[PDB]
Scaffold this active site. Structure first.
Site, mmCIF file in Angstrom:
data_model
loop_
_atom_site.group_PDB
_atom_site.id
_atom_site.type_symbol
_atom_site.label_atom_id
_atom_site.label_comp_id
_atom_site.label_asym_id
_atom_site.label_seq_id
_atom_site.Cartn_x
_atom_site.Cartn_y
_atom_site.Cartn_z
ATOM 1 N N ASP A 35 -21.276 18.337 -7.384
ATOM 2 C CA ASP A 35 -20.782 16.954 -7.867
ATOM 3 C C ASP A 35 -19.495 17.233 -8.714
ATOM 4 O O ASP A 35 -19.680 17.502 -9.821
ATOM 5 C CB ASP A 35 -21.738 15.976 -8.497
ATOM 6 C CG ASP A 35 -21.197 14.778 -8.777
ATOM 7 O OD1 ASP A 35 -19.945 14.466 -8.484
ATOM 8 O OD2 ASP A 35 -21.831 13.964 -9.476
ATOM 9 N N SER A 199 -1.713 11.549 -6.748
ATOM 10 C CA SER A 199 -1.120 11.477 -5.364
ATOM 11 C C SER A 199 0.181 11.125 -5.305
ATOM 12 O O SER A 199 0.646 10.003 -6.319
ATOM 13 C CB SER A 199 -2.031 10.958 -4.589
ATOM 14 O OG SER A 199 -1.885 10.837 -3.311
#
Ligand code: 47Y
Ligand code: 47Y
EC number: 3.4.23.22
Length: 330
Positions: A35, A199
């Site tokens: 994780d 992004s």
């Protein structure tokens, strides 16, 4: 040193991924959920409330000759999805894919919430976010990666998750045969303890690319892709009959649909998520309504590039002094 371990979907829908981890002496192998959105290595154990264990493999520290109770230490974690666990702490030898860390904090669960009990495939989590998020008190502990870092050939790990197939986590090296083209690296902020990056935009199917900054985290421990409502609406608008359902808890779509791809930008590069990656199957057994793999982050407070996004790429988690993230197509 290096390590290399195969990671395997837990079910036919890639609802999470498990990677075998050796703990203790002799080794006790547990299947952990790696994780990159959290920083605790915790396991189901011989100390876990019996009614909260249902089929998981447990760590039994009394059977490990290298286990040592970390005196006075406790831990308690609450995840973004509402799940939680807590307990006490041992140090022990932990190996992943041939890479060994001695003195690793292994957080032994005394309590776990229902979603953990109900998932018999996951024996615990191995956190790979920054150690500043580790919950051990009163002395915060380091992640497996941080402990391994100095010994690794290069201070990196890579995630290569498969779509409906096994994949690989590598530590200490970049497998140049595992991706196509070049890896594009992008800046990371560690201010919130995550692999947080921006992004450069997105496209839906064969549509034009929209240049827009989307701050979010690379999180292998989140199954789906959570993005701003505007982006998600633009995606599902291309699927006949798709709708956001309050009762179901997100966008659903007719299982008869062929889904469009979704592209996200990494600098000037583009990662394409095929439409099939966005199908999470019937909302309940026998239903013709299917759950979408792209969902709104509204009310999460952060955008999350979870497995739906990451499995379309070869992803480098570069843990150099100034961390960065790399993405390649594959
Ligand atoms: C059927 C199913 O669907 C899932 N979705 C996300 N996950 C990930 C949950 C992660 N959380 C506990 C921090 C699952 N483990 C799962 C299962 C099992
Ligand atoms: C993470 C997540 O949340 C969900 N909610 C409803 N359904 C249905 C899911 N299949 C699902 C998954 C996967």
């Amino acid at each position: 040193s290096t390590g290399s371990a195969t990671t395997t979907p837990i079910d036919s829908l890639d609802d999470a991924y498990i990677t075998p981890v050796q703990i203790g002496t002799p080794a006790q192998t547990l299947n952990l959920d790696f994780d990159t959105g959290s920083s605790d290595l915790w396991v189901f154990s011989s100390e876990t409330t019996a009614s909260e264990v249902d089929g998981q493999t447990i760590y039994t520290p009394s059977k490990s000759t290298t286990a040592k109770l970390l005196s006075g230490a406790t831990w308690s974690i609450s995840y973004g999805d509402g799940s939680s666990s807590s307990g006490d702490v041992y140090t022990d030898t932990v190996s992943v894919g041939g890479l060994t860390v001695t003195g690793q904090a292994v957080e032994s669960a005394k309590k776990v919430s229902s979603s953990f009990t109900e998932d018999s495939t996951i024996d615990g989590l191995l956190g790979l976010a920054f150690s500043t998020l580790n919950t051990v008190s009163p002395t915060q502990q380091k992640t497996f990666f941080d402990n391994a870092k100095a010994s690794l050939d290069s201070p990196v790990f890579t995630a290569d998750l498969g779509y409906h197939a096994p994949g690989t986590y590598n530590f200490g090296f970049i497998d140049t045969t595992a991706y196509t083209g070049s890896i594009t690296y992008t800046a990371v902020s560690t201010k919130q303890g995550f692999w947080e990056w921006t992004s450069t935009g997105y496209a839906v199917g064969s549509g034009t690319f929209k240049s827009t900054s989307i701050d979010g985290i690379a999180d292998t421990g989140t199954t789906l892709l959570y993005l701003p409502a505007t982006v998600v609406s633009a995606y599902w608008a291309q699927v006949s009959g798709a709708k956001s359902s309050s009762s179901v808890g997100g966008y659903v779509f007719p299982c008869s649909a062929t889904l469009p791809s979704f592209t996200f930008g990494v600098g000037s590069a583009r990662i394409v998520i095929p439409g099939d990656y966005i199908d999470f199957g019937p909302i309940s057994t026998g239903s013709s309504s299917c759950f979408g793999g792209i969902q709104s982050s509204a009310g999460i407070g952060i955008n999350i590039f979870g497995d739906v996004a990451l499995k379309a790429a070869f992803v480098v988690f570069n843990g150099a002094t100034t961390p960065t993230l790399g993405f390649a197509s594959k």
